[PDB]
Amino acid sequence: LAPLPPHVPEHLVFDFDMYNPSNLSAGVQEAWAVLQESNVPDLVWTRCNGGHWIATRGQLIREAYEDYRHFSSECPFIPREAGEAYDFIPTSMDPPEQRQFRALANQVVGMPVVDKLENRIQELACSLIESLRPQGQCNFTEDYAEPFPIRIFMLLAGLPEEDIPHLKYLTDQMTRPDGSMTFAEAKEALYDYLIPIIEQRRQKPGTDAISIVANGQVNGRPITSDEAKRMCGLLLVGGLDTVVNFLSFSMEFLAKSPEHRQELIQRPERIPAACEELLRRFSLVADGRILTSDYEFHGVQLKKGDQILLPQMLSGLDERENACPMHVDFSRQKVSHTTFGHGSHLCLGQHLARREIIVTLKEWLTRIPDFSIAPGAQIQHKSGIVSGVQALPLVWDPATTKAV
Numbered sequence: 075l076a077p078l079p080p081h082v083p084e085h086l087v088f089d090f091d092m093y094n095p096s097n098l099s100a101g102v103q104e105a106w107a108v109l110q111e112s113n114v115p116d117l118v119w120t121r122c123n124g125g126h127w128i129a130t131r132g133q134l135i136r137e138a139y140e141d142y143r144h145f146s147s148e149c150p151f152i153p154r155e156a157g158e159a160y161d162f163i164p165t166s167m168d169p170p171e172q173r174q175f176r177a178l179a180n181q182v183v184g185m186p187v188v189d190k191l192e193n194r195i196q197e198l199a200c201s202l203i204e205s206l207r208p209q210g211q212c213n214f215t216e217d218y219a220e221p222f223p224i225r226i227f228m229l230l231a232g233l234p235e236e237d238i239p240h241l242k243y244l245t246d247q248m249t250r251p252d253g254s255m256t257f258a259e260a261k262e263a264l265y266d267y268l269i270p271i272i273e274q275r276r277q278k279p280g281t282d283a284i285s286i287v288a289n290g291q292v293n294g295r296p297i298t299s300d301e302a303k304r305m306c307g308l309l310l311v312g313g314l315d316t317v318v319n320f321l322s323f324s325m326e327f328l329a330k331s332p333e334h335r336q337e338l339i340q341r342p343e344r345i346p347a348a349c350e351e352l353l354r355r356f357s358l359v360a361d362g363r364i365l366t367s368d369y370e371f372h373g374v375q376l377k378k379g380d381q382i383l384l385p386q387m388l389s390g391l392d393e394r395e396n397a398c399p400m401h402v403d404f405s406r407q408k409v410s411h412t413t414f415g416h417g418s419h420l421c422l423g424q425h426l427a428r429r430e431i432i433v434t435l436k437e438w439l440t441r442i443p444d445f446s447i448a449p450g451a452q453i454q455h456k457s458g459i460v461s462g463v464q465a466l467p468l469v470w471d472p473a474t475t476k477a478v
């Protein structure tokens with residue numbers, strides 16, 4: 075716990091640790107939900123991780139992400155040093171500067187790309203699941219959650235699969251550091267990996283994601299090697315962590331809820347809707363912004379330079395946004411959430427994300443309609459910029475499956 079700033083009132087102190095929440099054993103989302111208990115203020119200050127503010131309700135989370143004139147993405151991560159080393163593009167930029175680079179990235183992961191990858195996405199999912207089907211068991215995180223979205227991304231990026239172990243390790247230290255490496259070191263290592271690749275792809279322009287970025291233009295002029303590295307770096311982290319973790323959260327839930335499995339099996343056309351509801355309930359991201367000047371937010375005096383965590387994960391779990399938030403209802407009328415962010419930085423890979431999610435659910439339930447958490451297993455979650463599932467052992471009776 076760091077020394078409490080002079081301008082922060084004692085009653086707003088709620089020592090929540092984002093990389094190791096106290097009620098984590100009850101489930102990572104539940105651990106964060108504590109910030110929304112009846113007594114907890116809308117905006118509290120935690121002396122943990124160097125010290126920072128934490129907006130706990132969707133109304134404040136949304137407003138902050140919308141007001142980029144006060145809440146700047148220049149320093150988006152906690153701890154401070156990580157937020158200061160963080161220079162990925164376009165996430166470390168604010169409008170209007172951000173807009174030009176965001177258009178180029180949208181060109182490599184946007185919906186048009188999701189359409190080009192449709193077949194490979196479909197093929198890989200079915201292939202991985204069919205290989206697992208006869209086994210009657212699997213380590214979901216290692217056997218599907220990771221390989222499915224990561225191999226698709228490496229394919230798009232035109233990068234050898236043999237590089238996955240290294241890159242996944244680095245991305246992981248940026249979102250849920252184990253301690254061995256600082257954000258800055260992990261970031262430098264990732265950039266080191268990319269520098270030669272970007273240079274080769276600028277000499278021999280190709281069709282892959284790195285070549286498209288590196289040979290691209292930003293609102294009319296040539297992107298720089300430095301800018302390309304900063305953009306590609308972000309893309310790798312984006313393609314290697316969130317979807318991977320989200321899939322495990324969703325499968326864990328379905329593995330524990332026979333009735334929800336029944337519903338999608340009976341009405342597959344509801345899968346897209348179920349995807350959205352799961353995204354709300356199992357939202358998993360939480361980054362933030364930095365104050366550009368002294369500003370009073372919701373009755374609370376914020377100081378220039380202060381860091382504020384705006385958990386994208388919290389908005390959808392807020393009862394003021396969704397009645398009975400911890401409950402999963404695929405028929406929920408108005409599924410409100412900020413799972414893919416809010417404001418001008420709304421996730422660019424959300425379309426690739428939903429496709430991977432929907433395909434996974436459709437193809438998995440198609441072949442392995444019935445499954446459960448392995449006997450006696452206790453699922454462990456992890457927390458950080460991107461929260462996730464440590465391991466997910468599943469089992470099923472091969473006799474109930476079907477090859478398609």
Ligand code: HEM
Nearest residue numbers: 164165309312313316317320359414415419421422423427
């Ligand atoms: C379940 C999956 C995913 C979730 C929940 C998610 C969530 C988010 C969130 C919350 C942001 C904004 C953070 C901020 O405002 O500081 C974001 C940004 C971004 N995401 Fe994702 N994302 C997902 C999948 C992907 C995938 C598959 C990619 C593809 C590589 C990707 C690429 C990006 C990019 C490029 C940005 C930066 C946009 C900008 O700063 O303007 N995301 N994502």
Ligand SMILES: CC1(C)[C@@H]2CC[C@@]1(C)C(=O)C2
Nearest residue numbers: 165249311312359361459
């Ligand atoms: C917070 C994010 C999910 C968003 C894209 C990947 C991520 C970890 C970032 O650094 C920006």
Ligand SMILES: [C-]#N
Nearest residue numbers: 311312316421
């Ligand atoms: C976006 N990961």
